[PDB]
Ligand binder design. Structure first.
Ligand SMILES: COc1ccc2[nH]cc(CN(C)C)c2c1
Ligand SMILES: [Cl-]
Ligand SMILES: [Cl-]
Ligand SMILES: [Cl-]
Ligand SMILES: [Cl-]
Ligand SMILES: [Cl-]
Ligand SMILES: [Cl-]
Ligand SMILES: [Mg+2]
Length: 347
């Protein structure tokens, strides 16, 4: 066990191993975050102290879910876990959880608004998102919250996916003129049906379009305005997709709208690479069963310069059976403790 030291920073007590030095607050409902220098590895890191990790059954299970997910992710284009610790010496006094990751600087928002991107930049950025998604989807994980602020980018255009959706976002958070909804697939925005990993490909399409034009693709002022923007581009649904919408009321609302054909994407994305236009038509399909997958998209000709089928790995199997399990607070807490003390750091 390492030696810990205590200190109060912005009305919060931080008790961390000596290896972490020069802590400095950098943001704060999930927890508080500090930047630090890790003397063992030489990296600048983010140290997150979870807020009230075991206050309810829902909160205790969310804590376990986040720790299991971060411990599993081992891929160049996905954020991974550098360390996890608690100052507790026993399960009986276990109360605080700290997560350590690489410190991220710029996100894709900064780049999209402040840089002139060549077509080569768009190829490399979207390639890396799809490479990470092939890995994530191979373990039957759905990200659910892909958007520019959840993609970290450095000066060499290298990219990592972060901030997996832990089923956290509230009704108030998705209301009105907000980027938290502009990247969501319509079937999840309006609860049309049980969703699957195809919702992430819809998000990549929205992100790719914004890199090409400099503008948000579907900036709706509310759920209904956003649906109207979507259907004007991709067309209103046919009878085949209507069959798949479980809500009879949602089916009724859809059929209330006048029918519209799919638009010509070359006249929307004026001047873009014809291979980029072709890929966007295959991502932004209304029926989720018919969207291109991440593995299929990596082999698309738009990525000819970067695609290497021997360097696009898949994930180890990921057991999610705990999600359907019913446990008490102290049982979720004990499972979390076990995962903290069994952590083994990367090479
Ligand atoms: C600083 O932000 C990033 C974003 C993507 C990245 N890909 C590789 C690195 C550097 N690594 C030491 C974390 C990186 C940093
Ligand atoms: Cl230490
Ligand atoms: Cl990482
Ligand atoms: Cl503790
Ligand atoms: Cl965003
Ligand atoms: Cl009509
Ligand atoms: Cl597993
Ligand atoms: Mg985020």
């Amino acid at each position: 066990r390492p030696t810990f030291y205590r200190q109060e920073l912005n009305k919060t007590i931080w008790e961390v191993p000596e290896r972490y030095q020069n802590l400095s607050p950098v943001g704060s409902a999930y927890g508080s975050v500090c930047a630090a220098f890790d003397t063992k590895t030489g990296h600048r890191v983010a140290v997150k102290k979870l807020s009230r990790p075991f206050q309810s059954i829902i909160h205790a299970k969310r804590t376990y879910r986040e720790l299991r997910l971060l411990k599993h992710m081992k891929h160049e284009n996905v954020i991974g876990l550098l360390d996890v610790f608690t100052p507790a010496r026993s399960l009986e006094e276990f109360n605080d959880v700290y997560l350590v990751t690489h410190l991220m600087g710029a996100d894709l928002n900064n780049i999209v608004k402040c840089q002139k991107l060549t077509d080569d930049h768009v190829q490399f950025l979207i390639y890396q998102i799809l490479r990470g998604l092939k890995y994530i989807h191979s373990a039957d994980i759905i990200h659910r919250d892909l958007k520019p602020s959840n993609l970290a980018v450095n000066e060499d255009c290298e990219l990592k996916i972060l901030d997996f959706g832990l089923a956290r976002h509230t009704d108030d958070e998705m209301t009105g003129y907000v980027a938290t909804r502009w990247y969501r697939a319509p079937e999840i925005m309006l609860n049309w049906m049980h969703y699957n990993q195809t919702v992430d490909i819809w998000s990549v399409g929205c992100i790719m379009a914004e890199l090409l034009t400099g503008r948000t693709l579907f900036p709706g002022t509310d759920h209904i305005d956003q649906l109207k923007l979507i259907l004007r581009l991709v067309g209103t649904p046919g009878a085949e997709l209507l069959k798949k919408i479980s809500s009879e009321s949602a089916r009724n609302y859809i059929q209330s709208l006048a029918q519209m054909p799919k638009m010509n994407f070359a006249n929307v994305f004026i001047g873009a690479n014809p291979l980029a236009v072709d890929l966007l038509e295959k991502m932004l399909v209304l029926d989720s069963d018919k969207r291109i997958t991440a593995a299929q998209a990596l082999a698309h000709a738009y990525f000819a310069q970067y695609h290497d089928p021997d360097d696009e790995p898949v994930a180890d199997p990921y057991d999610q059976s705990f999600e359907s399990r019913d446990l008490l607070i102290d049982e979720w807490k004990s499972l979390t403790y076990d995962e903290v003390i069994s952590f083994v750091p990367p090479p």
